[PDB]
Paper text:
The core component of this machine is the envelope-associated needle complex, which consists of a multiring base, an inner rod, and a needle filament extension that protrudes several nanometers from the bacterial surface. The entire structure is traversed by an approximately 2-nm channel that serves as a conduit for the T3SS protein substrates as they pass through the bacterial envelope.
Since we observed no differences between the structures of in vivo and in vitro polymerized needle filaments, we solved the cryo-EM structures of PrgIS49A and PrgIV67A filaments assembled in vitro from purified mutant proteins. We found that S. Typhimurium strains expressing the PrgI mutants D10A, D11A, V20A, S49A, E53A, N55A, R58A, N63A, and N78A retained the ability to display SipD at the tip of the needle filament. However, no significant difference among PrgIWT, PrgIS49A, and PrgIV67A was detected in the structures of the monomers extracted from the assembled filaments, with a Cα RMSD over 77 residues of 0.152 Å between PrgIWT and PrgIS49A and 0.225 Å between PrgIWT and PrgIV67A. However, the predicted electrostatic potential of the lumens of filaments assembled with the PrgIS49A and PrgIV67A mutants showed significant differences with wild type. Taken together, these results indicate that the PrgI mutations resulted in defined structural changes altering the surface properties of the lumen, which may be responsible for the phenotypes observed in bacteria expressing these mutant filament proteins. Indeed, the two mutants analyzed by this approach showed subtle but distinct changes on the electrostatic properties of the lumen surface even though the mutated residues do not directly participate in configuring the lumen surface.
Author numbering:
A (entry chain P), B (entry chain J), C (entry chain D), D (entry chain I), E (entry chain A), F (entry chain O), ...: 3 to 80
Amino acid sequence: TPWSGYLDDVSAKFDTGVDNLQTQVTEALDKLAAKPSDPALLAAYQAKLSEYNLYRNAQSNTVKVFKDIDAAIIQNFR
Amino acid sequence: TPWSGYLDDVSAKFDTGVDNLQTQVTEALDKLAAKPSDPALLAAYQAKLSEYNLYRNAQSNTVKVFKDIDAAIIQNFR
Amino acid sequence: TPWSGYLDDVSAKFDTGVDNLQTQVTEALDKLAAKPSDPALLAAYQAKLSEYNLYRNAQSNTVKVFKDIDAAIIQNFR
Amino acid sequence: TPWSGYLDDVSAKFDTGVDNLQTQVTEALDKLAAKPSDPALLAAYQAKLSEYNLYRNAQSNTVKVFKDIDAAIIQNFR
Amino acid sequence: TPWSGYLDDVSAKFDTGVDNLQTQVTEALDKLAAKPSDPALLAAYQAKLSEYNLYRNAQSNTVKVFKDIDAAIIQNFR
Amino acid sequence: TPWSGYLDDVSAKFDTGVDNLQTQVTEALDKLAAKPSDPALLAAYQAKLSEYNLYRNAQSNTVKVFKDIDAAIIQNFR
Amino acid sequence: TPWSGYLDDVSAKFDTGVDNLQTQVTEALDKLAAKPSDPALLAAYQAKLSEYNLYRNAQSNTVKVFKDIDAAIIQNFR
Amino acid sequence: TPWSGYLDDVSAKFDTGVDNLQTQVTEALDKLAAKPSDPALLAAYQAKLSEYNLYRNAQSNTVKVFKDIDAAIIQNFR
Amino acid sequence: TPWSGYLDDVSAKFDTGVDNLQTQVTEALDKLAAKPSDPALLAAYQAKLSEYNLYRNAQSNTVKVFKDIDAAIIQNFR
Amino acid sequence: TPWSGYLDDVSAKFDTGVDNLQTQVTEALDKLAAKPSDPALLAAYQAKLSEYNLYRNAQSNTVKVFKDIDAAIIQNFR
Amino acid sequence: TPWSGYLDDVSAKFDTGVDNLQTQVTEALDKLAAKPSDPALLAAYQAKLSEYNLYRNAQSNTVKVFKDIDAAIIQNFR
Amino acid sequence: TPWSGYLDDVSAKFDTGVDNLQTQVTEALDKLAAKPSDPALLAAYQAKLSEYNLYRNAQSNTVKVFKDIDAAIIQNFR
Amino acid sequence: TPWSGYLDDVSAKFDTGVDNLQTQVTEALDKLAAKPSDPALLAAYQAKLSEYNLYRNAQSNTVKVFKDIDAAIIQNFR
Amino acid sequence: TPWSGYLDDVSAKFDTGVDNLQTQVTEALDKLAAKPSDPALLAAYQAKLSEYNLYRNAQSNTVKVFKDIDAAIIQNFR
Amino acid sequence: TPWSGYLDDVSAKFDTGVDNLQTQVTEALDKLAAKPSDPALLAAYQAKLSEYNLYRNAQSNTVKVFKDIDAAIIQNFR
Amino acid sequence: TPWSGYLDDVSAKFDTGVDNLQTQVTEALDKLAAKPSDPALLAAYQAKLSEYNLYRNAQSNTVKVFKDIDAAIIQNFR
Amino acid sequence: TPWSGYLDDVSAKFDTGVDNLQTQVTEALDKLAAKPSDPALLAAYQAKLSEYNLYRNAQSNTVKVFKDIDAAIIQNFR
Amino acid sequence: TPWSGYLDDVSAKFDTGVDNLQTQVTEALDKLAAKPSDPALLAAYQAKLSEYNLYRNAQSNTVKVFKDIDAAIIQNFR
Amino acid sequence: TPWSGYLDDVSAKFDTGVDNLQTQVTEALDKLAAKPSDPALLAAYQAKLSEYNLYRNAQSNTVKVFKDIDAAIIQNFR
Amino acid sequence: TPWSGYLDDVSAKFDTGVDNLQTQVTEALDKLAAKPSDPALLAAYQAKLSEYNLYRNAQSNTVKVFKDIDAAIIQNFR
């Protein structure tokens, strides 16, 4: 078992929160790439890609906030 | 059960809202393709196709608005 | 019961508005086809066919206007 | 009493501005659907439908302008 | 097997919908060209040519609508 | 009773300020999803969605300003 | 009193402009229908019907022009 | 007399600068709402609404600049 | 004296530029409505209506350009 | 009467300097929370909130400077 | 002096171009109406009426062309 | 083997997704250029060109979204 | 010498390109207005007017393209 | 002589660069307002207005760039 | 004569350096507030406001540097 | 030498194509007018007049086609 | 060798696709201009002119599509 | 030899990439200005102008991207 | 062998990580500069340039983080 | 010879590094100010201004870094 700190556990709450969003984006892109003119495949990929943008931005700002909460405690040791 | 977030649920309100509009367009196109000169088949396909344009544009703008409401909250975490 | 949106309901106001105009055209054509020289059958078919031209053009422009009223609202979501 | 904000009140100035334009369109369409060949019913429906296009486009652009006036104030809080 | 996307499949529903309309126009034109004064050959070619006008215009507008449904989804990715 | 600080109370002034805007958006979307072609349902949903964008952006910037007013006082303790 | 907008008032300038042209056409048709061989009744009905064609075409183009003048102002709000 | 600081006085230079622009927009909207098809009422409301967009954006950027001039002086006290 | 900004003054250059074009259209329509078959009244109304279309479109685009010149200056304050 | 030292008196010069700025922010937020789409309520709240940011930052830096002037005198007793 | 724009001046080049063609048609019709069997009065009225058809059609197409030249410049302001 | 990152692999999913769409456009253009009047060659080229527009726009927006997902992570390193 | 920028110089390439097309249209209209029934004067005016439509549309689109080339450079300064 | 800094001198290079473009726009608008149907006055005003859009946008972006070059030097004093 | 130390003299080099920049901002704001849509008044106020931002930031950083040069000499007395 | 564009050169191919058809019609009409009963003068004038009808209709349709070929290129600049 | 980009090469596929269609139109017009009454010269020129209309419209729309495919890639660089 | 940095060298790759596109646009405009009705001169100028739009937009976005790559390195010096 | 510290080795992990991305950008720009209208050359350059933006921003933030990790250790020596 | 320390010599490496970039910006602005609509003058000024932004920001950060390297040595004398 590799080491995983608190910022890893915050990042793994988002990773285990979504079930297979990293898989559903890649599958719906590969279904879209075979036929990039189907409205049932473009509107399904729009919902996957727009969630994957919002999943990944919220996951990359929650880590940055907890990095800044810790950087004002560690700076107050000395 | 695959994962479905909030933008999927907004997209699935439109998908479960219409009963079989993705089926009625394909059926009325296949009825039209056998005889593309019947006014009862052209005027019926006009109503299906024009709804399928308005169904899909409203479904692809409501996702884009909720993607922009979330992108101004996630940007205000830090 | 199949799904029928608003453009279907506008199209079905014209379809249920006329009682059997899709039937009276086909019957008066089949009466005309047996004897295409009777003035009582040509002048009766002229009134059916000219109404069926005006019925179907008004039914295919009212759908196109309501498709354009909706396409300026849906475009103003974002 | 349900909640109605400022964009609802701008939209309700148009809705209470016209008296029964949502009713006069539906009535003049149902009078037209029984007899879609009367020039007194086609020219009366043309005036109702063309106003209902201009009523609804001006009502759907005034909301979009006030949404853009507010989105440049709210963006200037921070 | 060559690649065929969704707009090709919509275009091939019209092409496989009619059986040999691209052949019946060319055959009835070549029968007409040998004797361009037969009313049984002019009235048969009128029905083929007028269907081939309506077949090809409906096939070239259904592609253009589905190109415009997709161009409002693809524009809403970003 | 759960704990609610000052930023929660600023966020709950917006939440208790609107009566049922989180409900009126979901209801007017579910009314729109059954028939996404009615201009009385698209223009009503435009006013709800555009208010819900302006409600939520002003609620997510007022919290961020009060977080920045406090972060310049807390930084001036030491 | 029912609501009447500007396109109704343009249409009612033509309707109140002619006194009883909608009545004189119907009366001169009912006088013609009893005896459709009188030159004093055919030449009088020709003048009524040809005016009623020019009355109704000018009334249905002046509305369409004012609908297009307004549709280039309303489109320039946003 | 309530308190009004410098950013209020900059905001009140715009408010007392225009005489009754907050009134002329509401009056020209209520005149437009009774008859949303008059070109003399649409082109007059276009000039009021487009000024009210430019009035309010310049008033909401001049406050934000003076908030940023002060935030670089106050930050240079310590 | 009511307030009139720069976009009002651009709109009032067109309004004071034409002397009584808003009056000459209404007078030539009321002269046309009494007798909608005179070629001296149809060709005179064609010249008034076609100028009133070009007057009002140029007046509603010059305001929109000056609204866009100002919206790129006001956006460059901050 | 509770005790109030010099840093309290510097803080109370800002508190008694503004009359009711702690009240005008809370009132203009509660007026904004009932209708968060009015430009007269967003631009008025922007001026209150931006002053309340500059009031409170200048009040929390003037105390910190006088704490540092005193901490270099008290350190020079011994 | 009433206002006369460019389309009026194009229309007045035709009106001042012919000297009294609007008078010569009415005079030669009133001379014809007293005796509608004279070949010197029918052949003179044929030349007046056929010129008045060609005068008025060229005058009503030159205005429509200059309305379309201007409508492609005014549309290219924005 | 040249280097290909993740945005290249997203771009190569579209390139390897379509089999020879870059070839079928060039071949159907060169077949069209020899005889630009065949409806079987214009309607076949319409389906290739409209897919090649939708293929290339979706391929040039999916790269731009993944460039923006990465630019909000890389910006949150520091 | 008045100032003339680059869009003036593009517009003056068309103005100095044609020698006296603004004069030949006005002269051939004034020759046509004296006798609007000569086929040598109608067919000569058709060639002048149709060139003056194509001269002025190409001159009003080349300015609009160069305005759009510059508006994507000026927008890329900041 | 009033004070004029460097951003004024950059703004006065554009103001003294064009000779009387602020005058030529107002003169060509006042010539257009007297007769808004002349193609020689619409195409001349299009070239003035499109230059005045490009003059003013380049003048309002060059100031904003030099404001940002200075704001990264002044921020690097301390 | 009131007392003015060295940091006052550095601050008064900026105050006497600009002639009436504190007056030209207030005058160009009061000219802008009467008509907040003139491009000659918005682009003139942009140059005044952007200089007044750069004047005041450089004046509030030069004082802070000389306060830090002195605070490392005074700290080196003891 | 006056200016002559491409539509003039197409019109001058017809004018220089026929040698003196504008002269032979006028001469054969003046020979016919002295004696309008000679079969050698009526049958010669029939051949001149019927050619002058076909000359002038083909000359006035070839200009209109080339005006429409150019109007679909000029419209595709922007 | 002059420079020729991709839109030139698309335009030169049409130019080198037809062998001498720009020559066959000019030759068949000059053969028609000498004798504009031959049915073997009118029906041959109809086939050349109608192909030259379809050649040039397809050549001027394929360039405009590839200009729009590129304008959505170049816009997605930044 | 004048100085040319890296953004000049990126801009000079586009300038030396095209051979004489700045010359071919000006030559094909001056050939078009002498005769703005030739389809061989309009379709040749369309290909030059549409390339010159795509040349200049790609040249003005590649500079802006490399300005933004450098502005995130220079900002990371301190 | 020149000296290369730890921040050089972190920078050389990115430089040796990509194989020839500094070469593939320059080659795909020089292929694009010869023909800046090919969609196969614009979409290939978009993927190279967008990776080169993300390569260089991640390489210029990882150095800045390791410079800040070291600057909090070196500051804790004394 | 005036005195120039090490930070002057670092600043003079940038000043003598570029040959006449302070001159080429002022010359290309004065060439742009005479004609602010030439794409060859806007795209040339974009490359000068964007380099002058990157020249001056790198010159104003390299001085600030060397000021901070020295301020941690001078602080370690005592």
